[PDB]
Write a protein that binds this DNA or RNA. Structure first.
Ligand SMILES: Nc1nc2c(ncn2[C@H]2C[C@H](O)[C@@H](COP(=O)(O)OP(=O)(O)OP(=O)(O)O)O2)c(=O)[nH]1
Ligand SMILES: [Mg+2]
Ligand SMILES: [Mg+2]
Length: 709
DNA sequence: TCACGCAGTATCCTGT
RNA sequence: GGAUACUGC
């Protein structure tokens, strides 16, 4: 009876079905002794709102303070008599909860006794600014259903969930193989310490042609590579694809060169030849339904691939468009909108991986075209089929087969790139750390991840989170450089996780600093307890540190090492974003004061460090917001290292959690301008010997807007 | 429906 | 005064 399944994606429709969340994932079946797709519909996720009592009764804001003390009974009576009837709410359940609060709404105390009202999602929605006579504010009016489910059930990222007493479905509701319905959200729980299951993956590449008359792109070939046991916690499987399927359709005008039959006969039996685009799209939809991939990967999938797929399906009236997704629906989502949210909805329940977004997030390249990505990652050369030659290729069997094989090779390249960067395992790790949905993580961006991280952190610690929204401050300090050429060892001292360590050390948090709705707030007292933001930051930092320790293992494979490096970078960025969102205008946690303070402290720190170095009678020639370059004026490497250690210790002696380390020893330096220099980093091998590696920072030579020559 | 912060260097244009 | 790029942290 207990349904144990691994959940990968969640989809909700705020307008069609209120209070229903469609989780999708994998379940284990002994009859087939394998893993099959499952769709669980959590129902009746009741709206929860919090009412804040007033200290003194106010005559509907007309007579102002009246002097009558207000208790929870007064608030409940006011809600039951006036608000409920006015806004057409039939049935609700109310209780009292003591909750804390520290955010950007004034007159809301730190810890207050709120009245929590729970009522179905079918009823209307109370206004945000609703003010009565006993309560001064209402929180949670527009909270989404998925957010409520995830936060209430403490679900963070893909994981194993147990459902008690599942129910079947009166009629089919999904294209999966197993379905269940949960009548309450309390029946779903998370079970920890279990391995992720394998997930099917389909890498697809399309080749189209632009019909000038309609200016609409028409599909002529599709290729797909499918793996049925792709892991989410281990290295990619070699080879990266198990099976494949290719479909080729004749254009609306041209005809085959009277030899396609023999060509396909002698080539292979896995190529399906169709005569009309309708048949091609139908066969593709049927194949997608049969394979049932949990991850669909491609290049420009959000931009061109899926948009053109849906457009052609609509134009050709191909039956059963919903096969492209995992939920059976009648009305297509509206074509348009920013990014690919319409495309995401069209493929609801199926994770979509655009290697362009992941490449932009993970690595840096001059261009993110497929050719450049293959050149830089896989180190291979990809041939390009001119757009004007695809149409003319329908004149010989050899050329058409070559076109189809080119599409196949493009799909293989996409899958190989996906495997190389560890897009999927890294996405899973980031999602688990943050707590968002995996599709959101793979769509790119940083705001959502930190938003959900802080949401979970605050909800777990008995807080009322804000309501979703419906050069502004000083930054770092860049010391004036002594531009020139230095032929002696240059010692670079860099701080470790500067801003996160500042947040931890000085205890900068929402609940610690006293903000007032553009001046730098005072540092919080040292007699308080560590807040939520510091603790979370610490966690992230520790994760990164552990990864670095792994990177330090001796005799490690190159590729694996690189992977670890990428991971480190990701985590660092996450922490930095946890800082930066504090000054993000459109963030759910806009706390510009706090961020300002952070930066200010950083500046102070740098200043102090510089002063100390000068008190040691050394020379300081550069520094960018956490670093100092010292002209050792020496040529004995060992001695330089000694000095490093010395100053390092000295600096550390002033701080508890902050740390400074030797970020590099430059044999020679060419310091041109602020944030523009070159050097020969010294990597010691042992016995006093060392190798030199060229390093450039900010020079035009490392910019993409100049001719390669 | 979206989207991390700020400091800094380089190039180019201002008619109806 | 403005506009367009992309480095640094
Ligand atoms: N908001 C934001 N801030 C950043 C980003 N990159 C760097 N910073 C800021 C915050 C960092 O604490 C500060 C110091 O830069 P670093 O590159 O030396 O990183 P950090 O010291 O945090 O760690 P590390 O020296 O690599 O161990 O610069 C970023 O991508 N976003
Ligand atoms: Mg640093
Ligand atoms: Mg000026």
């Amino acid at each position: 009876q207990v349904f144990r399944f691994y959940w990968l994606d969640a989809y909700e429709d705020q307008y069609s079905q209120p209070g229903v969340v469609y989780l999708f994932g994998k379940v284990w079946i002994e009859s087939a002794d394998a893993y099959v797709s499952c769709c669980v519909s959590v129902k009746n996720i009741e709206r929860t709102v919090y009412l804040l009592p007033r200290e003194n009764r106010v005559q509907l804001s007309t007579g102002k303070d009246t002097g009558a003390p207000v208790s929870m009974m007064h608030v409940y009576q006011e809600f039951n008599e006036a608000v409920a009837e006015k806004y057409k709410i039939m049935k609700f359940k109310s209780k009292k909860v003591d909750k804390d609060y520290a955010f950007e709404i004034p007159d809301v105390p730190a810890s207050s006794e709120y009245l929590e009202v729970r009522y179905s999602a079918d009823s209307p929605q109370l206004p945000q600014d609703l003010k009565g006579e006993t309560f001064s504010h209402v929180f949670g009016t527009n909270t989404s259903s998925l957010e409520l489910f995830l936060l209430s059930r403490k679900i963070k990222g893909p994981s194993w969930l147990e459902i008690k007493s599942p129910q079947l479905s009166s009629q089919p509701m999904s294209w999966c193989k197993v379905e269940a319905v949960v009548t309450r959200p309390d029946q779903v729980s998370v079970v920890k310490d279990l391995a992720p299951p394998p997930v099917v993956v389909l890498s697809l590449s399309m080749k189209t042609v632009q019909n000038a008359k309609t200016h609409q792109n028409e599909i002529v070939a599709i290729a797909a590579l499918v793996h049925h046991t792709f892991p989410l916690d281990k290295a990619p499987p070699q080879p990266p694809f198990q099976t494949h399927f290719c479909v080729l359709s004749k254009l609306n005008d041209c005809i085959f060169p009277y030899d396609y039959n023999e060509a396909v006969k002698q080539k292979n039996a896995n190529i399906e030849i169709a005569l009309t685009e309708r048949t091609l799209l139908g066969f593709f939809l049927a194949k997608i339904h049969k394979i049932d991939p949990d991850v669909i990967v491609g290049h420009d999938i959000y931009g061109f691939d899926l948009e053109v797929l849906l457009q052609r399906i609509n134009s050709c009236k191909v039956p059963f468009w919903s096969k492209i997704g995992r939920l059976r629906r009648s009305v297509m989502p509206k074509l348009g909108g920013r990014s690919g949210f319409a495309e995401r909805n069209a493929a609801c329940g199926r994770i979509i991986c655009d290697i362009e977004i992941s490449a932009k997030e993970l690595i840096r390249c001059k261009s993110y075209h497929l050719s450049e990505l293959v050149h830089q990652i896989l180190k291979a050369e990809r041939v390009v089929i001119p757009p004007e030659n695809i149409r003319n290729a329908y004149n010989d069997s050899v050329h058409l087969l070559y076109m189809l094989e080119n599409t196949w090779i493009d799909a293989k390249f996409i899958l190989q790139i996906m495997c190389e960067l560890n897009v999927l395992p890294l996405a899973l790790q980031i999602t688990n750390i943050a707590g968002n949905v995996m599709s959101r993580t793979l769509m790119g961006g940083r705001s959502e991840r930190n938003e959900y991280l802080l949401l979970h952190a605050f909800t777990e610690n008995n807080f009322i989170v804000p309501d979703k929204p419906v050069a502004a401050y000083a930054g770092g300090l860049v010391l004036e450089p002594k531009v020139g050429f230095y032929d002696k060892f240059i010692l670079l001292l860099d701080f470790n996780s500067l801003y996160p360590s500042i947040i931890q050390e000085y205890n900068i948090c929402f609940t610690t600093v006293h903000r007032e709705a553009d001046e730098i707030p005072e540092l919080p007292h040292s007699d308080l307890e560590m807040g939520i933001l510091p603790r979370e930051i610490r966690k992230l930092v520790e994760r990164r540190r552990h990864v670095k320790q792994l990177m330090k293992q001796p005799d490690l494979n190159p590729d694996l090492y690189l992977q670890y490096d990428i991971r480190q970078k990701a985590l660092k960025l996450t922490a930095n974003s946890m800082y930066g969102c504090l000054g993000f205008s459109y963030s759910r946690f806009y706390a510009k004061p706090l961020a300002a303070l952070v930066t200010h402290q950083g500046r102070e720190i740098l200043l102090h460090t510089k002063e100390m170095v000068q008190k040691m009678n050394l020379e300081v020639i550069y520094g960018d917001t956490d670093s100092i370059m010292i002209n050792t004026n020496c040529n004995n490497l060992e001695e330089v290292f000694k000095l490093g250690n010395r100053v390092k210790s000295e600096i550390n002696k002033s701080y508890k959690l902050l740390e400074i380390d030797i970020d590099g020893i430059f044999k020679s330096l060419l310091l041109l301008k602020k944030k523009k220099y070159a050097a020969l980093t010294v990597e010691p091998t042992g016995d006093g010997k060392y190798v030199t590696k060229q390093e450039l920072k900010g020079l035009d030579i490392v910019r993409r807007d100049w001719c390669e020559l």
